[PDB]
Amino acid sequence: SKEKILPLAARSKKAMLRQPKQVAYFSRDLNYKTHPDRSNLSYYYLPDGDIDNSIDLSVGSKHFLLGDSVELSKLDPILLALKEIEKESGAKTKDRIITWRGIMRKLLTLPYDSEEDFVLDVVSFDGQLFIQFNVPYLKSKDVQKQTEFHKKLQFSGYKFEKMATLPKPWPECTRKEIDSRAKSKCNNIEQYGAIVRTGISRIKILIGGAVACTADYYDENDPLSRYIELKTTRTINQYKDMIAFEKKLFRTWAQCFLLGIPKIIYGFRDDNCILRTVEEFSTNDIPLMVKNNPLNEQKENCYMSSINFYGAVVEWLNESVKDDQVWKLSYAKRNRQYLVLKEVTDENEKQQIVDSAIPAWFKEWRSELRN
Structure with a gap:
């Protein structure tokens, strides 16, 4: 089994970035059956009075159900989307x-936020690398998932959303449904998402993305501008707080910039799971705010290095597997020095991974496509 090593300090300054461009959208139901609709597409609305009312983010914690990542981190929604793309287009894109935005954001954050462990399938069916999480690794993640404080934090985030x-x-x-938001459950299953045909170097990439909610409505021409991502963290009170804040904004900017989402509404929950203050951000403004902070003015801008490293990673991926x-x-x-790109063998793990990642529905779909 051949293996290739990619140094962590490699950069590709040559590759520029194409603007993000959505192609199709989806609305996964509560039964993990993805549908081509906007059923779960929500609309942002929060007057200043609500955050003046000291809303509690911990109420109804026991009702917080959540699905499993094994069947969630599956390319099946994107696979269906591409299925209609080639259904009416008639030719392979x-x-x-x-892949999903999670892998991309993790590998973008790697040069400076390297506290991540993962295994990625690199299946190359029909000359289209369907990168996604290794399905046996997903089962192992359940043990690695393990407490109560973290689950309280995710519940706080979803309640804020x-x-x-x-x-x-x-x-x-x-x-009535305006004054019923606090009395509903927090389902971590149904989501609204869309596929984005971004671009780096000379490779076109399709990325799915769980869109939190649009700003005021859905713009039929440039939907990306109207999209908003909702996040919340502990309130800032000292220098360590704002340093952790800056790291969180780094990763959030990576996420949105890969999806090309301009707005960021960022909540500030207190110690006891209560929203205290909120404020907004623009995607393009993040590096300028980070590198022009009057408080603790003190290296260089990690954004360009991360972008170049991600371009080098894309070149590695498209040059490694044939x-x-x-x-x-x-x-x-x-x-902390290299990337582990090993190939699996024995014609059993390969076949089971291919079947799990790509259902035969897509595999048979390409058969008539070649016809």
Whole structure:
């Protein structure tokens, strides 16, 4: 089993970035059946009075259910989307890299935020690298998932998301469902997402993304501008707080910039899970705020280095695997020097990984496509 080593300090300054461009959207139901609709597409709404009212983010914690990552981190929604893309287009797309935003954000953050361990399938069916999490690794993640404070934090985030949104546009949204947001559950299953055909170097990449909610409505021409991402962290009170804040904004900027989402509404929950203050951000403004901070003015801008490293990673991916060759891309927190690109063999793990990642529905779909 051949293996290739990619140094962690490698950079590709040549590659420039194409602007993000959405192609299609989806609405996964509560039964993990993805549908091509905007059922879960919510609308942002939060007056200043609500954050003046000291809303509690911990109420109804026991009701917080959540699905499992094994069947969640699956390319099946993107696979269906591409299925109709080639259904009416009639020809395979030039896109090569297909994955989820989580892997991309993790590998962008790697040069400076390297505290991550993961294994990535590198299946190359039909000359289209369907990178996604290794399915046996997903089962192992359940043990690695393990407490109560972290789950409380995710519940705080989802409650903040539910409190600052609306199932319908504000005009048609009746008062009863305005004053019913706090009495609903927090389902971590149904989501609204879309596929983005971004670009780095000379490779077209399809990335799915769980869109939190649109700003005021859905713009039929440039939907990316109207999209908003909702996040919340502990309130800032000292220098260590704002340093952790800056790291969180680094990773959030990486996430949004890969999806090309301009706005960031960023909550500030206190010690006891209560929202205290909120404030907004623009995606393009993040590096300027970070590198022009009057407080603790003190290196260089990690954004360009991360972008160049990600371009080098894309070049590595498109140059390493030739065709229909499954690999396993992994990184250990103790490595800190290289990327582990090993290929799996024995014609059993390869076949089971291919079947799990790509259902036969897509595999048979390409058969008539070649016809």
